[PDB]
Design a protein around this ligand. Structure first.
Ligand SMILES: CCCCCCCCCCCC(=O)O
Ligand SMILES: CCCCCCCCCCCC(=O)O
Length: 90
Protein backbone atom coordinates (compact mmCIF):
# COMPACT_ATOMS: atom_id res chain seq x y z
CA UNK A 1 0.00 0.00 0.00
CA UNK A 2 1.38 3.37 -1.12
CA UNK A 3 0.01 6.77 -0.16
CA UNK A 4 -0.27 7.74 -3.83
CA UNK A 5 -2.93 5.07 -4.33
CA UNK A 6 -4.69 6.34 -1.20
CA UNK A 7 -4.73 9.88 -2.59
CA UNK A 8 -5.89 8.73 -6.03
CA UNK A 9 -8.74 6.71 -4.52
CA UNK A 10 -9.86 9.44 -2.11
CA UNK A 11 -9.62 12.33 -4.60
CA UNK A 12 -13.32 12.11 -5.65
CA UNK A 13 -14.26 12.48 -1.96
CA UNK A 14 -12.96 16.05 -1.61
CA UNK A 15 -16.27 17.61 -2.81
CA UNK A 16 -18.23 15.62 -0.22
CA UNK A 17 -15.59 16.29 2.45
CA UNK A 18 -15.79 20.07 1.92
CA UNK A 19 -19.43 20.64 0.88
CA UNK A 20 -21.16 17.71 2.59
CA UNK A 21 -24.28 16.17 1.12
CA UNK A 22 -24.00 12.61 -0.10
CA UNK A 23 -20.77 11.03 -1.37
CA UNK A 24 -21.08 10.28 -5.06
CA UNK A 25 -20.48 6.97 -6.78
CA UNK A 26 -16.82 7.75 -7.51
CA UNK A 27 -16.02 8.61 -3.88
CA UNK A 28 -17.67 5.47 -2.51
CA UNK A 29 -15.93 3.41 -5.20
CA UNK A 30 -12.59 4.85 -4.11
CA UNK A 31 -13.35 4.24 -0.43
CA UNK A 32 -14.25 0.61 -1.13
CA UNK A 33 -11.17 0.19 -3.34
CA UNK A 34 -8.94 1.42 -0.51
CA UNK A 35 -10.76 -0.78 2.02
CA UNK A 36 -10.46 -3.89 -0.15
CA UNK A 37 -6.80 -3.36 -1.05
CA UNK A 38 -5.63 -2.94 2.58
CA UNK A 39 -5.93 -6.47 3.99
CA UNK A 40 -3.01 -7.25 6.31
CA UNK A 41 -2.54 -5.27 9.55
CA UNK A 42 0.56 -3.63 8.06
CA UNK A 43 -1.39 -2.63 4.94
CA UNK A 44 -4.14 -1.14 7.12
CA UNK A 45 -1.62 0.77 9.24
CA UNK A 46 0.09 2.11 6.10
CA UNK A 47 -3.25 3.23 4.65
CA UNK A 48 -4.25 4.81 7.97
CA UNK A 49 -1.04 6.85 8.11
CA UNK A 50 -1.41 7.88 4.46
CA UNK A 51 -4.93 9.08 5.26
CA UNK A 52 -3.58 11.02 8.24
CA UNK A 53 -0.99 12.69 6.00
CA UNK A 54 -3.71 13.62 3.50
CA UNK A 55 -5.80 15.06 6.34
CA UNK A 56 -2.77 17.10 7.38
CA UNK A 57 -2.76 18.42 3.81
CA UNK A 58 -6.42 19.42 4.35
CA UNK A 59 -6.12 20.73 7.93
CA UNK A 60 -9.31 22.83 7.75
CA UNK A 61 -11.98 20.20 7.10
CA UNK A 62 -13.83 19.03 10.20
CA UNK A 63 -14.36 15.41 11.07
CA UNK A 64 -18.10 14.76 10.82
CA UNK A 65 -18.19 14.14 7.05
CA UNK A 66 -15.29 11.72 7.20
CA UNK A 67 -16.99 10.09 10.19
CA UNK A 68 -20.17 9.48 8.17
CA UNK A 69 -18.29 8.49 4.99
CA UNK A 70 -17.78 4.77 5.87
CA UNK A 71 -21.45 4.16 6.69
CA UNK A 72 -22.69 6.09 3.64
CA UNK A 73 -20.43 4.02 1.35
CA UNK A 74 -21.31 0.62 2.81
CA UNK A 75 -18.11 -0.16 4.74
CA UNK A 76 -17.24 -0.59 8.40
CA UNK A 77 -13.96 0.28 10.10
CA UNK A 78 -12.36 -0.69 13.40
CA UNK A 79 -11.09 2.85 14.08
CA UNK A 80 -12.84 6.22 14.48
CA UNK A 81 -12.31 8.64 11.61
CA UNK A 82 -10.28 11.24 13.52
CA UNK A 83 -7.15 13.31 12.98
CA UNK A 84 -5.80 12.30 16.38
CA UNK A 85 -5.96 8.48 16.21
CA UNK A 86 -2.65 6.63 16.44
CA UNK A 87 -2.48 4.33 13.42
CA UNK A 88 0.37 2.14 14.70
CA UNK A 89 -1.37 1.07 17.95
CA UNK A 90 -4.48 -0.99 17.16
C1 LIG B 1 -8.08 1.01 8.17
C2 LIG B 1 -7.28 0.72 6.91
C3 LIG B 1 -7.74 1.63 5.77
C4 LIG B 1 -9.09 1.14 5.25
C5 LIG B 1 -9.57 2.08 4.14
C6 LIG B 1 -10.66 3.00 4.68
C7 LIG B 1 -11.28 3.78 3.53
C8 LIG B 1 -11.18 5.28 3.82
C9 LIG B 1 -12.27 5.68 4.81
C10 LIG B 1 -11.90 7.00 5.48
C11 LIG B 1 -11.60 8.05 4.41
C12 LIG B 1 -11.50 9.42 5.07
O1 LIG B 1 -12.21 9.69 6.07
O2 LIG B 1 -10.70 10.28 4.61
C1 LIG C 1 -8.95 4.30 8.89
C2 LIG C 1 -9.79 5.56 8.79
C3 LIG C 1 -9.18 6.58 9.75
C4 LIG C 1 -8.07 7.32 8.99
C5 LIG C 1 -7.19 8.14 9.94
C6 LIG C 1 -7.49 9.64 9.88
C7 LIG C 1 -8.92 9.90 9.40
C8 LIG C 1 -9.44 11.22 9.94
C9 LIG C 1 -8.58 12.35 9.42
C10 LIG C 1 -9.49 13.55 9.21
C11 LIG C 1 -10.41 13.25 8.04
C12 LIG C 1 -10.75 14.56 7.34
O1 LIG C 1 -11.48 15.41 7.91
O2 LIG C 1 -10.29 14.79 6.19
Amino acid sequence: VTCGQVDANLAPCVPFLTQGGEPGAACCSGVKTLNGNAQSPDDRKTACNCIKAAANRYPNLKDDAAQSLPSKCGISLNVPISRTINCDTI
